Amino acid sequence: ALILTFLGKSGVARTKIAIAAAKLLASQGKRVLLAGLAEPVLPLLLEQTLTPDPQQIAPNLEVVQFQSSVLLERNWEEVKKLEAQYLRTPIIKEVYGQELVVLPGMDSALALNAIREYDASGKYDTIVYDGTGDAFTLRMLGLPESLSWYVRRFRQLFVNSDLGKTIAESPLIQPLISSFFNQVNNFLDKGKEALADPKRVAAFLVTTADPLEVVSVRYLWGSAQQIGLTIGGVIQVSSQTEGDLSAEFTPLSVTVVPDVTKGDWQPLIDALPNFVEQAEQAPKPITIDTHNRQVRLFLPGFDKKQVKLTQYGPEVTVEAGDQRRNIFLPPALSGRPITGAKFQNNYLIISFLEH
Amino acid sequence: ALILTFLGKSGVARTKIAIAAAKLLASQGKRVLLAGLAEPVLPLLLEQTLTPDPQQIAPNLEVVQFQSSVLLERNWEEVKKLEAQYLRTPIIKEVYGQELVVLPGMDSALALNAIREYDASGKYDTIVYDGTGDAFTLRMLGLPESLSWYVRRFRQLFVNSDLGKTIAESPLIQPLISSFFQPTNQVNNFLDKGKEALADPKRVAAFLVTTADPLEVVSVRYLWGSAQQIGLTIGGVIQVSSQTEGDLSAEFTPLSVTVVPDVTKGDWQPLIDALPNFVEQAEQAPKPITIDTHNRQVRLFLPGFDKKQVKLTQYGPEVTVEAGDQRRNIFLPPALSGRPITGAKFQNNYLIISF
């Protein structure tokens, strides 16, 4: 499925857009899941009580509310089943899933895993996700890449090292495991390949003509590029500020849409863009030119003072918008000092030494 | 210090109110730190470039911007020194802070710890925190209690298990730990101090921010109850302008609703002059939880929920209150510890639980 989401500073407008996008796509024969968070506006705008299980509200249109409490207790039962299997003496079987308290980070991990399950079921063409629309959403969506980076470092250290041997053989720990007792990369790589594919994950900016909102979504735009999230376009919603925003979002299409009054969704529905086509035509977050030995990063919303580069062996780290892209350099670039990092037309062009 | 924050659906209004509150309290002689996250509105409204370190911008007014990437990197250097101090062969000494990736949850822990450090320094009377103003801010502020509960439900399960009683009754452990290189009290002391502060309206308080749009009103009422679940005092409501007219006093009884004007073209004085007395309203507001030793009762303030969506259960050693997609595991104090529940009821937005 395509995971479709929206970024912007005003939650009510984002929810209306998500609802309208879901209605439009379901009306065209796409199988749609609209998923929101634990908050009362989506139910109220739909005039429907929502639950942690998808409910059909129209042909091809199901709606679900992610309640982290419920997702946590559902995952906890999977933890118990694994515990019985892999342990001779249970330890956490006592704890009921209804007791567990949601910690920061769990919220995003549980929501992303739920989305992954819905995506993997094959039941949907589009999963419209009405999230927080902000940097927390980006950190969620970036989990496949972020976890992959950690896994690759753990492997380098706690194993794939003498330490990996001083425990792999340790006659001290071996009996301790014998008592009471990768697939990971295929799992993460699937998430990574989806996130990078605009046919599988795309987001759209939502903003009024207020310059404060405009600068906020341009910052989110650049931050999204750091994680490889395609930004397909801009939805411009109404306010007391008038303005043509096309020049502020070149080369993206800006689509001006009307409000929703008294539950008449049709004018908004009719004004929405073709999300799939615009995502497919949007700029690419990263390209690598192996002949000229250059990395080209699309980084709208930032200038050179706001972007930091770090280069440690075969890895380059790009930090911008409080996000970090780790670039593992290919053979044409590895081992060569960076000789330039200059912005041209919202792209940062990183050059590597030829001589 | 007092940590003061704002909950609401529109970030721009929340940042404006945070700036005005900081300017107000500073002009009254309080030493103020204004702290925001990685986003461009606060610097633009202040006409000041912001950094990860406090900058004075007016008498008694310093401002700082939290960047998760920098907080993580600065925490890493402390982890790397501990390696040099308590481990035979370093493992992580070659991992560089610039490369670390911020995962979900990590961002919230790093920011709360940064706040903790600024509060511990004694340099400020008020810390005005411009956060995300939503459930994610609540899960962050609730960390001391949530962590305390995990330590308290699971320590016993792991120490008294067959595998735990073996780690104490096994000679394969002592020469294991020494192959490299009570905390339970130090941890609970650190956690209990955070829980104490959060429960004290002089140390932590939040105010709701909303327009008259019924959709915003219902949203902040839900956040209001969600905040009570974590023990966060909600001192009052700030009503900002919109195309919807309305007196909101009856919607938030017994809280004061203070109507405030916009800020246009750098003129902060109308907003400043309209802000409420934060300290006094927080002192007068309802208490999230009261334990009545005499009447053997626990009274939980739970406004803004559907009563059918408040669940009380005792699956484990403590009663669990589920509401607002948050869970409170009630630690019974001495006067109530070990007394069965004998009833519970709702009344004027309070859940009264009898023992």
Residue numbers in the entry:
A (entry chain A): 2 to 182, 196 to 369
B (entry chain B): 2 to 182, 193 to 366
The paper states:
In the eukaryotic cytoplasm, Get3 delivers tail-anchored (TA) integral membrane proteins, defined by a single transmembrane helix at their C terminus, to the endoplasmic reticulum. Get3d is conserved across land plants and photosynthetic bacteria and includes a distinctive C-terminal α-crystallin domain.
We solve the atomic structure of a plant Get3d and further refine a previously deposited structure of a cyanobacterial Get3d. With this map, we could clearly identify additional density consistent with the helices of AtGet3d that enclosed the CBD. As with AtGet3d, NosGet3d has some unidentified densities in the hydrophobic chamber. One prominent difference is that the helices enclosing the CBD in NosGet3d are further from the bottom of the chamber than in AtGet3d, resulting in a larger hydrophobic chamber. In cytoplasmic Get3 proteins, it has been shown that the highly conserved aspartate in switch I coordinates a water, helping to align the water for nucleophilic attack on the γ-phosphate. This aspartate is conserved in the Get3d family, with NosGet3d uniquely having a glutamate at this position, further supporting its evolutionary drift. This residue is highly conserved in Get3d proteins; however, it is a glutamate in NosGet3d, which may contribute to its lower Vmax. To investigate this, the ATPase activities of AtGet3d and NosGet3d were determined by monitoring the phosphate produced by Get3d in a spectrophotometric assay. Both AtGet3d and NosGet3d were found to have ATPase activity, with a Vmax of 12.0 ± 0.1 and 3.2 ± 0.1 nmol Pi/min/mg Get3 and kcat of 1.10 ± 0.01 and 0.28 ± 0.01 min−1, respectively.
